Design a binder for these strands. Structure first.
Lengths: 207, 295, 168, 57, 158
RNA sequence: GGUUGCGGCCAUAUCUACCAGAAAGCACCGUUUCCCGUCCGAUCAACUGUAGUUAAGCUGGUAAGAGCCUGACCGAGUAGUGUAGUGGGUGACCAUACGCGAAACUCAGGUGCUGCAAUCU
């Protein structure tokens, strides 16, 4: 299995599994969400990201073992129901390889493994949590840095959970009635759409 | 499950078919063909003979087509026919032949081709296209729009054709879809065509119902027994009309009764008005406040 | 309010599907031609099934469309065979309905042992006036909501006339 | 082995000429134009020639 | 093997449009292309006959000929080092009138009147166009408009 | 203003659900002798405008509507990018300088207009 330095940079065009490539191995990271993924939005206010600072590809192989450290560390310290890691990066891109008699006559590659192309500032990992936990999350993510190549840097967000609302904005909107909790993620009452449809849901609003 | 197929996605993506098409009004596939003239003729218009049988009326216009929006040269409605004699049956074959024949004579008066191109005066129901006169102007050439109506051997549309043809227009056409054409032989029974020109096919159905079933003969034809116009006088009505048209078809408009402005003011009572942005917000605000205390 | 929404039988259809193509077919054709009076039409398949045992474009299932007075009389002959007792099903959500019988021997006629025995898919379409609206060429359009022949209303129409029942 | 294609230098080469325009002319070749039109445009020109002779009198 | 067939690489160029398939609006066919008219060339997938070669998409020519369903259009295409005039034979449906000539023709009609008005009144004209000049001097008021002290902001996360 | 005929641009015109329509017109609507077409006068054909009706169509109006459009120092002068450097950076890429400059997003407003001909309390 080829050392990651080969495929590290984002060189070739995004070449995915399709009705041309068809043949490809599976990913390693076949599972993205961890811990208490069923948890409610209000439970885990504090998002800590792990953000690229680099325009590098990430082999699935790494992404699994990065995920498995932040899994295995956070679960060790604060437990399984402590947090929700969501990997926000999907090995779609396929890496080829010129395996080998012909030399370089007809040297186009067969598929080797998947990789997840990652721009600068792009989130990779994100662990929502209670603000109490923070360090025990981070310190897991600091271990998952060691699995990845290049550079990335963990960043405590000023956004509620994964919710695009900021920490203050969310609290304003929630303690009103504009927010209702769905399963995963918060749905917002608009000022738009059929009112009957908007009244049935969000009965806490309008009162 | 059910199926679910009118998501935002659908609408956003969906293409509105023109509007005429959407109001099942017209065949743009045939408009393409019918309207577009030789570009090497340039601005010369291509006049096209609109013929439309509404439920209980005929409308016949000779139309030119522009980018602007197709313009009318002359218009003959069947409801203008009682000024020439015909009260009863204004969706017949004969009525068509009236409206058709009249069209020619409307237009030909408004093109200065009255005297030359009189059309078929005698009317034997003989198949004759209006041949041109040597060393003179040619006849006004109109192509028939059937449109989204069907053409079926012996339909009224071709009445209005044959009228216009026999009224002086050159309208390129063929024989077969006139009635009395032998399906099993390339021929015309010219006697059977006269009859349709002079409501003769109607005067036969008059004649049969006189003896047999006087139930429907009093139901239908109430116009005929009221005016005391019996079967065999129908020919003379259409005959005299044709001549009456040939005389003086130059179009009088209606007496009006009430001005445009009076009309509008009267219809404007019934049309409902829209609402300001605030007036909708007032309704929504009222709807919101109706559900804060629950009832 | 209710004046013109009169709700009458637009067409009655008698399908006799058979799985082959020959004598059995042409007899089943004759049956309808004697039943309905009108010369029925032989439909053809879309694709070869094998298991059922038909090839594509082979033609066998015969149907006939009937409308007006004669349909009303044939319906009444059919519902006699069901005993004026359909189901809560046997009723389209589209306000139409049918009821399949075995053996054409019922509703008058004879056994006719030479011609053979055949069931008959009765299916009836309830359409209110202003159904031309849709089928007319110049200026087609969809029928309004208030005028859509419904399951609930047709059933009540069917309970009203023909002293019939819903059963389930 | 040997290199296959290029267009290197190839514009630079073209601008040593100049990239000289078509040049254009009053009276372009009526060759190619609709023969129906052409035919009558001859009689047209036959007509106008005769008329300019008549005006010189 | 390489390929360069008549409609090579058109995937998107003739791809009809979005939400504008099917029948062509009838004004298209009405428009009168006299000889000398200047015309641009957009292909129209739909209309397969008389379709211009993928080159001339975009290109803008002159009408040298008109006929039954079609104009001739001379487009001078560059080729190597020397523009060969090329005579197309396109159906109307692949043409549009050139708006660039329309604007110019108007500007002539104005330049007729600006001269006719001026010579009648008192000669003085100035009636070319002129490229937007350097802005002239002016007073700008602080009254009801006191200038805001901006500053570059500190870098926050996002 | 309403309606009809033919139209132009082709959703500001589509769609969904619910209301209103005087006049005329439209329509649905009645009939099968004839021309005509079907398995079936449903469609198409013809005949009547008579027996009936605005139920449907059609039109108009309503909806914190879907869609559609239009706009905005709404996002974003961002992303991208043309040119410049003996600028940075191991590199990956990035920062600047002169330039051009999006899209989602956010909010606001709108929801057919219009030509010719004819007709209507």
């Amino acid at each position: 299995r080829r050392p990651a330095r080969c495929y590290r940079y984002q060189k070739n065009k995004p070449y995915p599994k399709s009705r041309y490539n068809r043949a490809v191995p599976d990913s390693k990271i076949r599972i993205y969400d961890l811990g208490k993924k069923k948890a409610t939005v209000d439970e885990f206010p504090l998002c800590v990201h792990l953000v690229s600072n680099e325009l590098e590809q990430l082999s699935s192989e790494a992404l699994e073992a990065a995920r498995i450290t932040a899994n295995k560390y956070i679960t060790k310290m604060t437990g399984r129901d402590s947090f929700h890691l969501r990997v926000r990066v999907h090995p779609f891109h396929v890496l080829r390889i010129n395996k080998m008699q012909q030399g370089m006559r007809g040297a186009w590659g067969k598929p080797h493994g998947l990789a997840a192309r990652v721009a600068i500032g792009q989130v990779i990992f994100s662990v929502r949590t209670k603000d109490n936990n923070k360090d025990t999350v981070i310190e897991g993510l600091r271990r998952a840095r060691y699995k990845f190549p290049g550079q990335q840097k963990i960043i405590i967000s000023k956004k509620w959970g994964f919710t695009s609302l900021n920490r203050e904005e969310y609290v304003k909107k929630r303690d009103a009635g504009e927010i209702k909790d769905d399963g995963a993620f918060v749905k917002f009452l608009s000022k738009k759409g059929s009112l009957e449809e908007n009244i049935r849901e969000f009965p806490e609003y309008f009162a | 499950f059910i199926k679910d197929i009118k998501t935002s996605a659908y609408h956003s993506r969906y293409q509105t078919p023109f509007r005429r098409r959407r109001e099942g009004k017209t065949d743009y596939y045939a408009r393409k063909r019918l309207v577009a003239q030789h570009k090497a003729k340039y601005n010369t218009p291509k006049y096209r003979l609109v013929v439309r049988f509404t439920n209980k009326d005929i409308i016949t216009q000779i139309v030119s087509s522009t980018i602007t929006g197709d313009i009318v040269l002359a218009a003959a409605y069947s409801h203008e026919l009682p000024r020439y004699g015909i009260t009863h049956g204004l969706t017949n074959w004969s009525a068509a032949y009236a409206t058709g024949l009249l069209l020619a004579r409307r237009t030909l008066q408004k093109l200065g081709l009255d005297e030359t191109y009189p059309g078929v005066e005698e009317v034997e129901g003989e198949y004759e296209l209006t041949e041109a006169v040597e060393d003179g102007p040619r006849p006004f050439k109109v192509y028939l729009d059937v449109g989204l109506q069907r053409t079926t051997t012996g339909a009224r549309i071709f009445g209005a054709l044959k009228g216009a043809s026999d009224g002086g227009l050159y309208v390129p056409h063929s024989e077969n879809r006139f009635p009395g054409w032998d399906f099993e032989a390339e021929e015309l029974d010219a006697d059977l065509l006269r009859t349709y020109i002079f409501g003769g096919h109607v005067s036969q159905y008059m004649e049969e119902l006189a003896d047999d079933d006087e139930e429907r003969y009093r139901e239908l034809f109430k116009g005929y027994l009221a005016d005391d116009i019996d079967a065999d006088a129908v020919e003379d009505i259409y005959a005299d009309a044709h001549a009456a048209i040939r005389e003086d078809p130059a179009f009088k408009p209606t007496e009006k009764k009430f001005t445009k402005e009076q009309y509008a003011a009267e219809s404007k009572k019934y049309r409902q008005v829209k609402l300001t942005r605030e007036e909708r917000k007032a309704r929504v605000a009222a709807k919101i406040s109706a559900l804060a205390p629950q009832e | 309010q209710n004046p013109m929404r009169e709700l009458k039988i637009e067409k009655l259809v008698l399908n006799i599907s058979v799985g082959e193509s020959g004598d059995r077919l042409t007899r089943a054709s004759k049956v309808l031609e004697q039943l309905s009076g009108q010369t029925p039409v032989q439909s053809k398949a879309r694709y070869t099934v094998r298991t059922f045992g038909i090839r594509r474009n082979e033609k066998i299932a015969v149907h006939v469309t009937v409308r007006g007075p004669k349909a009303e009389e044939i319906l009444e002959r059919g519902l006699k065979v069901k005993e004026y007792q359909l189901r809560n099903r046997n009723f389209s959500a589209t306000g139409n309905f049918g009821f399949g019988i075995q053996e054409h021997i019922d509703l008058g006629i004879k056994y006719d042992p030479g011609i053979g025995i055949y069931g008959m898919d009765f299916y009836i379409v309830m359409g209110r006036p202003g159904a031309r609206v849709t089928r007319r060429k110049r200026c087609q359009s969809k029928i309004g909501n208030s005028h859509k022949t419904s399951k609930e209303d047709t059933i009540a129409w069917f309970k009203q006339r023909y002293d019939a029942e819903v059963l389930d | 082995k040997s290199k296959n294609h290029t267009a290197h230098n190839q514009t630079k080469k073209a601008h040593r000429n100049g990239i000289k325009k078509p040049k254009t002319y009053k009276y372009p070749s009526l060759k190619g134009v609709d023969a129906k039109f052409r035919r009558n445009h001859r009689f047209a020109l036959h007509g106008t020639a005769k008329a300019l002779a008549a005006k010189r009198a | 093997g390489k390929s360069h067939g008549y409609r090579s690489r058109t995937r998107y160029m003739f791809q009809r449009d979005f939400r504008k398939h099917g029948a062509i609006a009838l004004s298209t066919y009405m428009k009168v292309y006299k000889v000398g008219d200047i015309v641009d060339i957009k292909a129209n997938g739909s209309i397969h006959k008389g379709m211009p070669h993928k080159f001339y998409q975009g290109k803008t020519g002159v009408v040298y000929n008109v006929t039954k369903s079609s104009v001739g259009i001379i487009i001078n295409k560059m080729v190597g080092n020397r523009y060969l005039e090329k005579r197309l034979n396109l159906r109307v449906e692949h043409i549009k009138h050139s708006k660039c000539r329309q604007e110019f023709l108007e500007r002539v009609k104005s330049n007729a009147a600006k001269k006719a008005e001026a010579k009648a009144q008192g000669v003085a004209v100035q009636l070319k166009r002129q490229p937007a000049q350097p802005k002239e001097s002016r007073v700008v008021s602080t009254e009801g408009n006191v200038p805001q002290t901006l500053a570059p902001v500190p870098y926050e996360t996002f």
